[PDB]
Symmetry: C3
């Protein structure tokens, strides 16, 4: 049987809210390592890779490798019935007819139980595992989100140029051009201002802002975000869940 | 000068109207020596809204004649959106009037607002005066009941309320799946705003429309507590204590 | 060359947001005195007069008289990229193809540059000098906003009656009639409820509520608003910018 209990439902609520606009029907692959998700955007441009590690659940039990086909639209509606501080418990039997979601309140003696009907979904192989990147940028997710939404007002595409002197986010449209330059800064001793850049080679790539702004819906999950760049491979946008991660892969248009 | 009613806080009338405006549009305000009452049926004649504002909540209160005041609630909300919650509300009227006067006085600033709302002629006729005998009576936090309705409303348009000797269960099923919230009889002892009381003579299981219940829960601002009265062969009663007196919602079960 | 540096971008953000729904294409007239704007509403009824004095900028440079044709919709998109506490710097040369907007952040230390394409708008105006008003009403901007929005629900027209003892806002529509009377009172203990009236003569005038509610989009600029009334001249609604003003002129309905 499967059982995973989150002290605060807030985590799962926000993770689903970050993916719901890209993927709708996808599998939640469960084993002793935790709950993982790998699904491609409906337009086959972006890939979403999520991992919820077993050490983030208390307790966590998974007797069998199991695939749970779940509509994310169905799940978000149910998860909006849970408050952020509610005790969330996900349960399942040795058969995938339905998934059980239990919402316990720490204060009020109120118990909420939901049974979501499962679906039959087949997963992809899927590429790609572990690419070595030419540039790695760790910056505040809140800052990265504002940069994306701001430039999205001027154009539908953004140019990311990463050199040894910093990272430049370029943009141009009918209205005009837009530019955001962040400098590599370390040991501010105030971690909300830190930007680290590991660079093996300069990179200049163009991406869709429509996807990046969707990626930035995971800003509530982590204060930090990691951008991994190289041509011939998709952009990697990773968010730290603490005990796990949420990764976004996005193919370049350049 | 026939009718005069003064409310300490305009918030009360603001919240009552805001809870009903989406159900009833045209209705009568029945006024006599006892106070101001409203009894109106949903536009689809499924739900009944019953309000009673007793005269002891007004200072002063004057009503020379039993009178019915036909008032459009849309018009009334626009006027009531001009009143702050802590304004002194004064409702005035002449003998058998064309319009009703609403005066909003500010306790702080030297600001006075006066409005004259044109009346309409609406007939109700009958009417009971029910005195229903219920099999189960549930007193629970209104904030909790509102969340239960709105949460289950996401999965389906229909809800099953089961009240037994061991508690009350709100059950639901839809295309997505099933949902259930069970509340236990609880007493505090610690925080009495979380208390749940159940008076039960016999178990009851009825099905109701969540679309109406969610609308009923717009009265959550009126009381921290809500009372659910259930019995077979009769509609659900959802009552809110206004503090002399009450706001009631009646909803027929779905066969 | 033109250079103007605002300590807080919030001011320009709010000013544009106050005018954007009346005027969209207009010139920003710049000289050594400062940056001024004078444009008429699209329906050719209301006149908007803005002045940003040079003493409000640090630093401020303008070598030659220049007009900057700017779409407010485009500018709003760009100014929504600036945080309220960002250092805003407006730069342009004499021969203007475009205007450069620089957003420096005091916190995240992020620099944003935008190049907004200018438009060709021809300059012209009407004289408006030391007009003598019969009644001057200083009241809370928030209350004036509340009064207009409330009465606008009942009617399209408002009657403003100003005496030495206070101001009455009258209204009548299909639903019924509405009236708000405020008394001239001052009480430093609460400067947000104070109403002062400078009156040489009683005034009773009728105005369009649709324009007044738009004027009240400048409420974010000042806690106070000034109403200047007279039967022989249009209504003046002024908001103090601190270093200058934003003026709305509205003709009475005879």
């Amino acid at each position: 049987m499967l059982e995973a209990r989150l002290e605060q439902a807030s985590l799962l609520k926000r993770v689903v809210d970050a993916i719901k606009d890209l993927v709708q029907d996808c599998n939640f692959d469960c084993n002793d390592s935790g709950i993982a998700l790998q699904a491609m955007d409906n337009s086959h441009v972006a890939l979403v890779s999520m991992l919820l590690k077993a050490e983030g659940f208390s307790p966590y039990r998974c007797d069998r490798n199991i695939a749970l086909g779940i509509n994310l639209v169905s799940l978000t509606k149910v998860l909006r019935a849970a408050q952020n501080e509610d005790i969330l418990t996900l349960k399942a039997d040795d058969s995938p007819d339905a998934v059980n979601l239990m919402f316990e309140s720490a204060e009020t003696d109120r118990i909420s139980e939901y049974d979501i009907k499962l679906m039959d979904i087949d997963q992809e192989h899927l590429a790609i595992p572990e690419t070595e990147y030419a540039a790695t940028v760790e910056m505040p997710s809140a800052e990265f989100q504002r940069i994306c939404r701001d430039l999205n007002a001027l154009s539908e595409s953004v140019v990311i140029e990463a050199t040894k002197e910093g990272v430049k986010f370029s943009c141009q449209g009918d209205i005009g051009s837009g530019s955001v330059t962040i400098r590599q800064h370390t040991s501010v001793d105030k971690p909300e201002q830190n930007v680290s850049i590991a660079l093996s080679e300069p990179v200049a790539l163009t991406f869709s802002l429509k996807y990046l702004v969707n990626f930035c819906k995971a800003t509530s999950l982590s204060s930090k975000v990691t951008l991994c760049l190289s041509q011939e491979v998709p952009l990697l946008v990773e968010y730290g869940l603490g005990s796990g991660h949420l990764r976004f892969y996005l193919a370049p248009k350049i």
